[PDB]
């Protein structure tokens, strides 16, 4: 009896759920009330960060001649980058390993 | 009854299928991406909560989210995240 429903993600042109981000902002005890553009902005930022890490990890997977992204590929993509390594500084990635790092004195 | 147990897995898969149309992802890597999205959500929402509390506001808006992004992300990462969030709120309010 009413109009056809459109999701706020498709209205904002996004892939992450604006409605779920809004409900988590309401239920996470962050403020008394939550504006309308705040879950849109936050879902966009989370989608950008997800896309950046997934594209770098897919490039690392392709450079390893593989077609499936593994935690080693995420570890390489994050630790071969100044800004992502500074963002995920105190973060341990499980089954990610270390970077190949042999000091030049030993060679 | 097994509970709901919601996640970001199908959304991360949707983003992966448009940055790499032929690349899959393992279940452990999907769990790590889910942990990443939850960690960055909690970090930005906590900083925006502290901003609204410092400025004596009851509302978290896109301006609080924007300045929390500028405080938390380093370098050009903050710049491109701000342009992406601004483009999304413009496209949302235009519709």
């Amino acid at each position, epitope marked *: 009896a009413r109009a056809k429903a459109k999701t706020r993600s498709s209205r904002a042109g996004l892939q992450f759920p604006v409605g779920r981000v809004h409900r988590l902002l309401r239920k996470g005890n962050y403020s008394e009330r939550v504006g309308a553009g705040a879950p849109v902005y936050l879902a966009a930022v989370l989608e950008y960060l997800t896309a950046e890490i997934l594209e770098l990890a897919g490039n690392a997977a392709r450079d390893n001649k593989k077609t499936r992204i593994i935690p080693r590929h995420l570890q390489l993509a994050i630790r*071969n*980058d*100044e*800004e992502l390594n500074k963002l995920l500084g105190r973060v341990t990635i499980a089954q990610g390993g270390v970077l190949p790092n042999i000091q030049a004195v030993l060679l | 009854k097994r509970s709901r147990k919601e996640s970001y897995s199908i959304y991360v898969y949707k983003v992966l299928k448009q940055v790499h149309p032929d690349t899959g992802i393992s279940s452990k890597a999907m769990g790590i991406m889910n942990s990443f999205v939850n960690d960055i959500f909690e970090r930005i929402a906590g900083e925006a909560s502290r901003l609204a509390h410092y400025n004596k506001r009851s509302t978290i808006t896109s301006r609080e989210i924007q300045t929390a992004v500028r405080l938390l992300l380093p370098g*050009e990462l903050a710049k*491109h995240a701000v*342009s992406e969030g601004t483009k999304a709120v413009t496209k949302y309010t235009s519709a």
Partner: single-chain antibody
Amino acid sequence: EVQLQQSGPELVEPGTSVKMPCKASGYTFTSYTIQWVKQTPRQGLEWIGYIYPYNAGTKYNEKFKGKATLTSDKSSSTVYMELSSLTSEDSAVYYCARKSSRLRSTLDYWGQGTSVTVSSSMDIKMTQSPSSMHASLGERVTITCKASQDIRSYLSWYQQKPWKSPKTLIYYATSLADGVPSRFSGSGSGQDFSLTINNLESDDTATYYCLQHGESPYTFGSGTKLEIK
């Protein structure tokens, strides 16, 4: 501001070697790659390679593998480029450009260039569909850079005054660079891209280039010369 100091012009002999600097200042030096561009006035702009001073990681074009070597020095914030076995097809200007490791970032800030005069491939091709145009001081001019394979909006635009360094106009196929007025506008995705200027002046007399950085050999365009009347 961000400035990439670069050496003066050099006149050298064949078979010798040139080590040219790219002394950088005004930013955190390890957070950004330093890219290298060759400009001959018969093949246009060509991408050579970059070094990433955070981990000394390099990547080279296949035309310059073995011809070029890139080194960095964190204490001096200087990136050197070594050219070996100099030939007559090296009489060019060698720019060093500042690029972030972000995938949608482009060559932001450029050096003034170093003229090096030697005194005697399954990649993406970029197609400037106009090569030279003519317009008056108020007309609207479109410039297209139809691509070859596919680039999902990883395209940038540059203008270049004669005997000057290129200036970034648009990155990520639509976004304006810093200090660029809203007269410049870009559009397109996939393979078809376009560049548009609304209110022309004498400042809009330059050569307009398109750069793709979606795939790892970076490829410029052929160039488009626009001049004012």
